[PDB]
Every structure is written in structure tokens, then in C-alpha cells.
Amino acid sequence: RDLDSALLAEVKDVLIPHERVVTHSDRVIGKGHFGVVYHGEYIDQAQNRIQCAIKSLSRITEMQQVEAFLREGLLMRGLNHPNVLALIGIMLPPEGLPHVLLPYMCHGDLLQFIRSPQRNPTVKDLISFGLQVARGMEYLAEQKFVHRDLAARNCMLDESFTVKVADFGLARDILDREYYSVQQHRHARLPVKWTALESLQTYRFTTKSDVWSFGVLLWELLTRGAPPYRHIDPFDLTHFLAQGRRLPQPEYCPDSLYQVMQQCWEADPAVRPTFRVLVGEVEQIVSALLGDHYVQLP
Ligand SMILES: Nc1ncnc2c1ncn2[C@@H]1O[C@H](COP(=O)(O)OP(=O)(O)NP(=O)(O)O)[C@@H](O)[C@H]1O
Ligand SMILES: [Mg+2]
């Protein structure tokens, strides 16, 4: 579109020109709040054609929102970690929504992996996945990035089942208020149920809001994808958590890992651990584990 030339110069390194990209509109991978993700293809700097996923960003109408995203996207282009999903780049078609090109992750998301009846995950298998998420997130936090929507579904699995943390950089402070709104009848899987008590009262997010969300993610892993706070009337959730009640310890979840989960859900954000400490504590648990067993589905 007709954007500030100075901006496009400023953000050059993120941008893939639209004529280097093919989005397969007939090959939709999936749909969600922030946009649609299609199968796609793009042309390298080295001139080869690489297949990947492409997400049309449906929540960026304003030009202020476009340029803000372009600049975050530049910082995200710099993110390099084994447990973080890479940003290939962003494409602006002459008229339309910004598109985000992402590496295709061929084993899907962590939630569907764990929910699969074709699979028989052990306790230790699931804790390991959690460990890989805490490294993804430790890096993001070190790089001054706040996810805002950490959950099992936004953790992808690559060819060799390496977990990549993903869909950070989409939700924003205050502007995406409605994404974290209450009372929507079909409420079992809304982001409200993963997000920290104080973020629900301001729609401002920090790394410590991400530590809450991680705890909730770690519960999913060990329930093999149960909805959190399932039977809590959605309008009663903030009051419930203020009472100091929390998700119950999963059947086969070790006491120590539940103690970790509890630390993540501390109501004082400052009392919650850092992801650096979480990688350490969770790693220690995996090695300390005496025996192992299968976990069942809810
Ligand atoms: N890089 C990728 N490679 C493969 N699949 C992807 C990629 N990024 C997103 N997806 C999938 O695209 C679909 C839509 O993503 P999204 O709109 O974020 O849905 P979601 O609500 O976050 N997860 P879900 O529980 O599947 O609805 C999901 O099925 C994702 O697993
Ligand atoms: Mg996602």
C-alpha cells in the first residue's frame, strides 16, 4: 500500500516483497482470531523456493497498527533460538492485510499432540515438553519479549518433535482487550483462562504474566489437554482466583512440579519465578524423577 517510504526503508530487513511469495488460498491450514494461516511458498535470497506457512493478519486495519507491527516484526526477525518459532518475514500485498511467513511445522501443535489417542505419553515425556517451552520463553524474556497468549496450542512441533514457542507478537497491551473478555457461552478455551489475575484487571502484560500462563500450560501437559477452570462460571473466575483457589494437582503430576505450578500462580507477580529458574527447577525434576508412567486422557 502507500506507506511511509522512510518506514519501509527502516524495516527493510523484515520485508519479503509480495512478488517473492505464493499463498495457496485453497490450502487453508487453520483459522483463528488474529488471521488465517495458509500453506505457502516463497523465494530465497539464495533463489530456491521454500514451502512454509503464511498467516494473513486480520486485526491490523489502522496504519498506526501496521507500522507498529512492522517495527516489532523487525525485532522478531532477530530472534534466534531452537525452541522459538522463527519469523521468515512479513509481506505487504499492494492491497490487503499484512502476511507473516513462518516455517511449516509438520507435527502441529502441542495440544493436539497430547490429545491424540494414537499416542501414549509418559509423565516424563510431558515434563520434557514443558522444559523445552521454558527455554523458548526464557530466551523471549531475555530479549524483552512478552508473549501474551502462551498456551499449548501456540507451541508447535517440528520434524524431530522439537517444541517451538509461537504466536508471540500478535496480541497487544490494551488494544486486544476483547480477546481476553469474559462471558461468551462457549468459554471453555478462551485466553482469559490462561491469563494472569492482574492482566485481567488491566490488559497489561509482563513476563510475570507469561509465568502465570506457563503454569497453566504445564497443567495442560499433565492433564493431556483438559480445559482449565472448566466448571467455573466464566463471570466468577476473577473472584474465584482472588479467593486463592487454583487448578487442582493432576493425577500423575509430581508434588514438586505442582509446587512449581503454584509458584507461577502467586498473586504477587514479583513472587513468581523467572523462566531461568524454571528451566533449572523443571530440569532438576526430570532427572530426579523416580520411575515413570503413562498418562491417560480426560
Ligand atoms: N508455522 C506453522 N506450521 C504449521 N501449522 C501452523 C503454523 N502456525 C500455525 N499453524 C496452525 O494453524 C492453525 C491456526 O492457528 P491459530 O489461528 O493460532 O489457531 P489457535 O487458536 O492458536 N490453535 P487451535 O487450538 O488449533 O485452534 C492451528 O491449527 C495451528 O496449529
Ligand atoms: Mg496458535
CATH number of the domain encompassing residue 218: 1.10.510.10
Co-location of 176 and 188 in the same domain? yes
Co-location of 173 and 41 in the same domain? no
Residue 37, φ and ψ in degrees, nearest 5:
-110, 120
Q: Does the beta carbon of 176 sit less than 6 angstroms from any atom of ligand 1? A: no
Write the burial class of residue 286 (CB in 10 Å: 0-12 exposed, 13-18 middle, 19+ buried): middle
Q: Is 104 annotated as a binding residue?
A: yes
Strands 155-157 and 49-57: unpaired
* Residues facing 157 on adjacent strands: 163
Give the CA radius of gyration of the chain.
20
Compute CA distances 269 → 117, 205, 239, 264, whole Å.
37, 11, 17, 8
Q: Does the beta carbon of 114 sit less than 6 angstroms from any atom of ligand 1? A: no
Measure 153 CA to ligand 2 centroid, in angstroms.
5
For residue 154, which ligand has an atom nearest its CA? 2
3-state helix/strand/coil string of the chain? CCCCHHHHHHCHHHECCHHHEEEEEEEEEEEECCEEEEEEEEECCCCCEEEEEEEEECCCCCHHHHHHHHHHHHHHHCCCCCCECCCCEEECCCCCCCEEEECCCCCCEHHHHHHCCCCCCEHHHHHHHHHHHHHHHHHHHHCCCCCCCCCCCCEEECCCCCEEECCCCCCCCCCCHHHHCCCCCCCCCCHHHHCCHHHHCCCCCCHHHHHHHHHHHHHHHHHCCCCCCCCCCHHHHHHHHHCCCCCCCCCCCCHHHHHHHHHHCCCCHHHCCCHHHHHHHHHHHHHHCCCCCECCCC
CATH number of the domain encompassing residue 27: 3.30.200.20
Q: Report the C-alpha gap between 285 and 192 in whole angstroms.
A: 29
Co-location of 110 and 97 in the same domain? no
Co-location of 45 and 99 in the same domain? yes
Co-location of 187 and 281 in the same domain? yes
Residues taking part in catalysis: 149
Co-location of 96 and 138 in the same domain? no
Strands 35-43 and 89-91: unpaired
Domain end among 59, 80, 104: 104
Co-location of 159 and 259 in the same domain? yes
Co-location of 96 and 133 in the same domain? no
Domain end among 72, 88, 104: 104
Query: Structural domain tally of the chain?
Result: 2
Q: Is 124 annotated as a binding residue?
A: no
Q: Is 32 annotated as a binding residue?
A: yes
For residue 191, which ligand has an atom nearest its CA? 1
Query: Could you tell me if 198 and 209 are in contact, meaning their C-beta atoms sit under 8 angstroms apart?
Result: yes
Give the residue whose CA is nearest to atom 14 of ligand 1.
Answer: 30
Co-location of 134 and 80 in the same domain? no
Q: Does the beta carbon of 87 sit less than 6 angstroms from any atom of ligand 1? A: no
Question: Exposure pattern of 248-261 as b/e (b: 16+ CB <10 Å)?
Answer: ebbebbbeebbebb
Measured on CA atoms in the order 279, 280, 285, 287, is the torsion positive or negative? positive
Co-location of 233 and 292 in the same domain? yes
Q: Does the beta carbon of 105 sit less than 6 angstroms from any atom of ligand 1? A: yes
Co-location of 163 and 260 in the same domain? yes
* Residues facing 90 on adjacent strands: 15, 100
Compute CA distances 8 → 4, 16, 92, 114, 246, whole Å.
7, 11, 10, 42, 47
Angle between helices 275-288 and 207-223 (to 10 degrees): 20
Co-location of 152 and 279 in the same domain? yes
Residue type, 122: T
Measure 32 CA to ligand 1 centroid, in angstroms.
8
Domain span at residue 260 reads 105-298
Q: Does the beta carbon of 102 sit less than 6 angstroms from any atom of ligand 1? A: yes
Domain end among 46, 79, 104: 104
Q: Report the C-alpha gap between 190 and 178 in whole angstroms.
A: 11
In this structure, how many other beta carbons lie within 10 angstroms of the beta carbon of residue 41? 15
Three cell numbers, residue 217: 500450560
Terminal-residue alpha carbon distance, the chain: 49
Q: Is 244 annotated as a binding residue?
A: no
